[PDB]
C-alpha cells in the first residue's frame, strides 16, 4: 500500500548520499500520491534537479520548489487542500507539506530534524525517512537561522523504489 521513494542528494554537484522515504498512502493517499509522482517524474516534471532552498539547523530541511519563494506545483493544479492532520510531527525524519496557509499545498515539503509539535494541525504529515537520516543530518550543516543555504544542495536523482 505504502510506496517508498528515494532522493540521491548532492552538494555542489558532488554526491552526498541517498535518503529514502516511506509515504503514508494508507492515511493520506492524495498527499502521498502527489509526492510519489513528483519523485518519479511521470507527469513530466518533478523533484529531480531541484534544491533544498531553506535549511534551518535544529528544525527542518525544506525543498520541492522546482519551478524556480512560494513556487512549485502539485500534480492536481497549483494548490490542494490539507487532506487531514491525523499524523503528528513526532521527531526527526518526519516528512510534511510546506504551505502558505490553510489548503495551500503544492510541491514544497520539509523533513523534520527535531520534534516540531507546534506544526501539528498546520502542516500535513505524509511520510518519514526510512534510510539515510544521517544524510539529512549532514544537510542541516549547510543551513542558517535565516534558512539560507551555504551550498547548492540538490536532488541529483529521485524515483520510486
Amino acid at each position: 500500500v505504502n510506496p517508498t521513494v528515494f532522493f540521491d542528494i548532492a552538494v555542489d554537484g558532488e554526491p552526498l548520499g541517498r535518503v529514502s522515504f516511506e509515504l503514508f498512502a494508507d492515511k493520506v493517499p492524495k498527499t502521498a500520491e502527489n509526492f510519489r509522482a513528483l519523485s518519479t517524474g511521470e507527469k513530466g516534471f518533478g523533484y529531480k534537479g531541484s534544491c533544498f532552498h531553506r535549511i534551518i539547523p535544529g528544525f527542518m530541511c525544506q525543498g520541492g520548489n522546482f519551478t524556480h519563494g512560494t513556487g512549485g506545483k502539485s500534480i492536481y493544479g497549483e494548490k490542494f487542500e490539507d487532506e487531514n492532520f491525523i499524523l503528528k510531527h513526532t521527531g526527526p525524519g518526519i516528512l510534511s507539506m510546506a504551505n502558505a496557509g490553510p489548503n495551500t499545498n503544492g510541491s514544497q515539503f520539509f523533513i523534520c530534524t527535531a520534534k516540531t509539535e507546534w506544526l501539528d494541525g498546520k502542516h500535513v504529515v505524509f511520510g518519514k525517512v526510512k534510510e539515510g537520516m544521517n544524510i539529512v543530518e549532514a544537510m542541516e550543516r549547510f543551513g542558517s537561522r535565516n534558512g539560507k543555504t551555504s551550498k547548492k544542495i540538490t536532488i541529483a536523482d529521485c524515483g520510486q523504489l
Binding site: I56, F59, G69, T116, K122
Partner: protein
C-alpha cells in the same frame, strides 16, 4: 501605546471624541488623530475609533476604507511559505494590521521586532485615508 504596552490615556480618548463631535475642528480631525495615536497598537487605534458614540454611518464608511486597504495589503504581500521557525509568528496579513485577526501580543511582537514590522503605523495610514473621505463627506 508601546512605551511594554501601556493603555491609551483617558483624555487622549477625550481629545478625540471632542474633536470628532465639533464641526469647527473638522480640519484638525486628521492632525489630532495623528497626535493622539503616537506609538499606538492596532488595538489602541480600534479602541480610540470605537469610543465615539453617535457617528455610526461615518464609522461604517471608515471601516469600508480600512477593509479595502487591508485587502490591497494582502494583494501586494502574499504570505510567506511555512513552516514557521520556532519563536516566529507570521508576517501580518491586512486583517492582522487592522487588529481584527491579531492579538495585542502579536501586535507588540511585530512592533518590537528587529527590524520593526510597524503594524500600528501602517494601520494609522489606512485610518487617515478613511478619515479624509469622512472629513470630505460627513
Amino acid at each position: 501605546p508601546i512605551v511594554v504596552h501601556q493603555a491609551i490615556s483617558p483624555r487622549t480618548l477625550n481629545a478625540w471624541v471632542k474633536v470628532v463631535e465639533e464641526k469647527a475642528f473638522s480640519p484638525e480631525v486628521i492632525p489630532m488623530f495623528s497626535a493622539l495615536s503616537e506609538g499606538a497598537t492596532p488595538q489602541d487605534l480600534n479602541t480610540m475609533l470605537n469610543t465615539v458614540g453617535g457617528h455610526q454611518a461615518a464609522m461604517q464608511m471608515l471601516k469600508e476604507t480600512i477593509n479595502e486597504e487591508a485587502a490591497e495589503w494582502d494583494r501586494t504581500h502574499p504570505p510567506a511559505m511555512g513552516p514557521l521557525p520556532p519563536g516566529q509568528i507570521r508576517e501580518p496579513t491586512g486583517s492582522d494590521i487592522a487588529g481584527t485577526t491579531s492579538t495585542l501580543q502579536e501586535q507588540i511582537g511585530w512592533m518590537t521586532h528587529n527590524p520593526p514590522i510597524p503594524v500600528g503605523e501602517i494601520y494609522k495610514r489606512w485610518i487617515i485615508l478613511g478619515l479624509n473621505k469622512i472629513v470630505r463627506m460627513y
